[PDB]
Design a protein around this ligand. Structure first.
Ligand SMILES: O=C(c1ccc(F)nc1)N1CCC[C@@H]1c1nc(Nc2cc(C3CC3)[nH]n2)c2cccn2n1
Length: 302
């Protein structure tokens, strides 16, 4: 209850909303431009989240306090919060713009249409490794900052104009990939196909179970976002995973990438590599700019 304005408060006048990006949890999300949100830049391309006009006072406070979790983060591989407009209406939350949208939708858009037209080949191992490192870098940064994600999935990663993959905005929720969630034990909605055996048994999530879900993200990149354990129902996924069952090596998936998936899928969470360990194993394969922008190569990484 009660949202208190702070240093993240931006004057409404500085924001210009243009085209819709799509329906969000609390309202329409727009693309636009902002004045003085990235230092003194007069014109920054931004994403603008809104609260619908009818919404109560509580909903606006809930929206504001939820988005305020992002105020703590500053990483090149984590989608940035740039400002808040909590004075007057519409209530807004200004964030970094990712023109290519979610990673699952981006991956699914790469599938051959099948209409006799020429098609771009599936992402190369180099392009797949680049995406791996970016995600793992965002995640190592969050873990270092004492966070456990609990819903690492391609749907919860965003693709920038230049193809940079980043960890998407937190607690987004509702309306998007409903089939990606299951009412386990007839209780709360859980991303069961992305869950570790231990999080399936006891409902506890750690950086180790985030590591398990990273392995599943690599599998989504490799399959162009197929449903994990596609032939199985949600109940069958639960039995299969807790019993030590694993995803199949995607067709034409390089061994090196499948080996990495298998490390993330070690039954014992303590035998799974950390995000730092994952980055280290692939640092040689990343674009040269990675050494200058990553959390991995930063002073903050111990
Ligand atoms: O990603 C989806 C989406 C996902 C699946 C689906 F089926 N429909 C929409 N949506 C719907 C609302 C906004 C969002 C969304 N967001 C985009 N960019 C963003 C968002 C942010 C933080 C939130 C402000 N920065 N950049 C974006 C670019 C292209 C399509 N989208 N869609």
């Amino acid at each position: 209850d009660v949202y208190v304005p702070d240093e993240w408060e931006v004057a409404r006048e500085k924001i210009t909303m243009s085209r819709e990006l799509g329906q969000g949890s609390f309202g329409m999300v727009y693309e636009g431009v902002a004045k003085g949100v990235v230092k003194d830049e007069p014109e920054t391309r931004v994403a603008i989240k809104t609260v619908n006009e009818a919404a109560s006072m509580r909903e606006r406070i809930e929206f504001l306090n939820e988005a305020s979790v992002m105020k703590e983060f500053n990483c090149h591989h984590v989608v940035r919060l740039l400002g808040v407009v909590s004075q007057g209406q519409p209530t807004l939350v200004i964030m970094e713009l990712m023109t290519r949208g979610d990673l699952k939708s981006y991956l699914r858009s790469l599938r051959p249409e099948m209409e006799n037209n020429p098609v771009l080949a599936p992402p190369s191992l180099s392009k797949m490794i680049q995406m791996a490192g970016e995600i793992a870098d965002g995640m190592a940064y969050l873990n270092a900052n004492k966070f456990v994600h609990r819903d690492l999935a391609a749907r919860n990663c965003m693709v920038a104009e230049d193809f940079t993959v980043k960890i998407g905005d937190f607690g987004m929720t509702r309306d998007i990939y409903e089939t990606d969630y299951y009412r386990k034990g007839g209780k709360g909605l859980l991303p069961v196909r992305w869950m570790s055996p231990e999080s399936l048994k006891d409902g506890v999530f750690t950086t180790y179970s985030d590591v398990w879900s990273f392995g599943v993200v690599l599998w989504e990149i490799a399959t162009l976002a197929e449903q994990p354990y596609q032939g199985l129902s949600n109940e069958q996924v639960l039995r299969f995973v807790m019993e030590g069952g694993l995803l199949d090596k995607p067709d034409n998936c390089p061994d090196m990438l499948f080996e990495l998936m298998r490390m993330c899928w070690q039954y014992n969470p303590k035998m799974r590599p950390s995000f730092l360990e994952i980055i280290s194993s692939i640092k040689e394969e990343m674009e040269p700019g990675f050494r200058e922008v990553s959390f991995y190569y930063s002073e903050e990484n111990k």
